Specification:
part of a larger assembly; 2 chains; A: about 50 residues; mainly alpha; 2 helices; about 0% strand; B: about 50 residues; little secondary structure; rod-shaped; virus like particle; Bacteriophage T4; decorated capsid; Mature major capsid protein; Mature capsid vertex protein
């Protein structure tokens, strides 16, 4: 499983300013968390899939 | 592809104030002296020839 993300440099500046959060870490904090949720869903999904 | 159109700016920074004042000039153009009563009296003493 894999995922990608595309953030512009100027967005990193604006997000670092104004609000005050690093634009880079959020996408890493989103993609990695999202993938783990899907796998954690797939394990649950298979159980109901295979249940009698 | 998160551009800068996704993040919405907050309060714009106030960089500069701009007042408008004339180069007021009356200390140098006239001669001033504080009067201690609501009526100010100047003395004009003139030197006259025998023809006034």
């Amino acid at each position: 499983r894999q995922l990608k993300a595309a953030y512009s440099i100027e967005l990193a500046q604006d997000l670092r300013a104004v609000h005050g959060m690093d634009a880079d870490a959020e996408l890493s904090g989103i993609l990695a968390t999202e993938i783990m949720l899907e796998i954690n869903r797939e394990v649950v999904d298979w159980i109901n899939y295979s249940a009698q | 592809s998160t551009t800068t159109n996704s993040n919405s700016i907050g309060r714009p920074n106030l960089v500069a104030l701009t007042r408008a004042t004339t180069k007021l000039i009356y200390s140098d153009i006239v001669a001033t002296q504080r009067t201690n009563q609501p009526v100010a009296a100047f003395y004009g003493i003139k030197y006259l020839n025998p023809d006034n």
